[PDB]
Design an enzyme around this catalytic site. Structure first.
Site, PDB file in Angstrom:
ATOM      1  CB  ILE A   1       7.304  12.394  -1.376  1.00  0.00           C
ATOM      2  CG1 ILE A   1       8.244  11.623  -0.855  1.00  0.00           C
ATOM      3  CG2 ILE A   1       6.314  13.068  -0.703  1.00  0.00           C
ATOM      4  CD1 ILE A   1       9.335  12.790  -0.506  1.00  0.00           C
TER       5      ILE A   1
ATOM      6  CE  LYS B   1     -21.059 -16.228  -2.714  1.00  0.00           C
ATOM      7  NZ  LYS B   1     -21.161 -15.466  -1.177  1.00  0.00           N
TER       8      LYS B   1
ATOM      9  N   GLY C   1     -15.627 -14.805  -1.284  1.00  0.00           N
ATOM     10  CA  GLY C   1     -16.523 -15.316  -0.443  1.00  0.00           C
ATOM     11  C   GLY C   1     -16.015 -16.902  -0.293  1.00  0.00           C
ATOM     12  CB  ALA C   2     -15.538 -19.077   2.108  1.00  0.00           C
TER      13      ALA C   2
ATOM     14  CE  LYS D   1      -4.075  -2.265   0.719  1.00  0.00           C
ATOM     15  NZ  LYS D   1      -3.532  -3.670   1.171  1.00  0.00           N
TER      16      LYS D   1
ATOM     17  CG  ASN E   1      13.882  10.586  -2.745  1.00  0.00           C
ATOM     18  OD1 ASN E   1      14.667   9.920  -3.605  1.00  0.00           O
ATOM     19  ND2 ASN E   1      14.459  10.462  -1.316  1.00  0.00           N
TER      20      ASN E   1
ATOM     21  N   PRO F   1      -9.795  -9.539  -3.695  1.00  0.00           N
ATOM     22  CG  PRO F   1      -9.247  -8.125  -2.058  1.00  0.00           C
ATOM     23  CD  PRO F   1      -9.151  -8.433  -3.611  1.00  0.00           C
ATOM     24  N   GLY F   2     -11.706 -11.147  -0.932  1.00  0.00           N
ATOM     25  CA  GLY F   2     -12.987 -11.239  -0.515  1.00  0.00           C
ATOM     26  C   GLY F   2     -14.068 -11.805  -1.284  1.00  0.00           C
TER      27      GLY F   2
END
Lengths: 208, 208
Positions: A63, A170, A165-166, A59, A65, A162-163
């Site tokens: 800046i 899905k 579903g399980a 993530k 540099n 991601p997410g």
């Protein structure tokens, strides 16, 4: 097409799990918590032990540099892709892209994302289209959103989600909707048999 | 009061530079470059060698649970403050604040900042006012912005300003405009004699 979110912080434990499901996943995604606990060399260790590509979910949002200093070190450490925020600007994204493959965040799924990030997803996608990162990452909770993003995203840029579903079906549904990669964590690393679980997700996706 | 942005990879180099300028600084700010190159325990080491407070400039921008895991690890390693982005939402900010003191990013200095971050500065100042972090980061490139933010920011919240005029007496103006802390990185760590470089800035801020 499956990316293992290896959110297991006992280092050798995480490595054992990653090695056990190696044959059924395309990449392993590691976060800051794992890198902080095991050190950045956990990336080379995973690669050596599994032969799978690594996504460093960092993530980045500094800046140019500074983003550059970080990316040079992480790609140098073996990371195959680095996840970066789009909101810090094109120059900060480009500083990372010039050093390695990147995945841009264009949408998030927590309640706080509704405040500033998500109202800008449409614009972040347009920015991603101009930057041409390896892929973008957005939640896969609703297959309709995956499709929405795919419709707007330049062909050639991958979607990682991601997410999804399980529940049964899905994984297959997210891929058909436009996800090139689905990111799965707990359903795999917390299964009684991680390999069996990863194998079952694989079977669902390559099946009908 | 000067905050040293120690953005180098090597621990022995970082410790040597920090000890040599300790007399002229108030805090040391560690970012991902140094944590990656030396391990997160460099926070503790820097504190043991200088006795000043440590700010972990992590630009946290993840979902609440991930921000929490990172904050818990970094605060647990000795960090006194953690820098978080306001952009990802209030919940992600509070996940960190519940574990330790924070500094919020409300504006940035690079050209990319003009695309998404800076347009929301007024809104971010209002979010910070509600949360009441230890301080906020606002670029000091132009003391105009420091004063703009100081007028709108709740009195008890401090202002830390990086990007200070790499020119003449700009640090002094920034402080005069309302900056409690001046963040200096390259001007000191890349200096031929870091101690003399730190002292010069220190003398300027302290003079009239």
């Amino acid at each position: 097409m499956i990316v293992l979110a290896l959110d297991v912080y006992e280092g050798e434990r995480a490595i054992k799990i990653a090695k056990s499901v190696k044959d059924y996943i395309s990449m392993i995604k590691v976060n800051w918590p794992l890198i902080l606990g095991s050190g950045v060399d956990i990336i080379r260790r995973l690669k050596e032990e599994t032969g799978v590509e690594i996504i460093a979910d960092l993530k980045l949002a500094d800046i140019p540099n500074t983003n550059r200093l970080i990316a040079r070190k992480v790609f140098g450490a073996g990371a195959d892709y680095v996840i970066v925020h789009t909101f810090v600007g094109r120059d900060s994204v480009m500083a990372v892209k010039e050093l390695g493959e990147i995945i841009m965040v264009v949408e998030m799924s927590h309640p706080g994302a509704l405040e500033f990030i998500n109202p800008l997803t449409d614009r972040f996608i347009e920015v991603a289209n101009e930057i041409e990162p390896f892929g973008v990452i957005a939640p896969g909770t609703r297959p309709e959103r995956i499709g929405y993003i795919r419709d707007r995203l330049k062909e050639g840029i991958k979607i990682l989600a991601p997410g999804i579903g399980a529940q049964g079906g899905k994984a297959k549904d997210a891929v058909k909707a436009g996800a090139d990669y689905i990111i799965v964590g707990r359903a795999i690393y917390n299964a009684p048999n991680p390999r069996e679980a990863a194998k079952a997700i694989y079977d669902e996706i390559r099946g009908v």
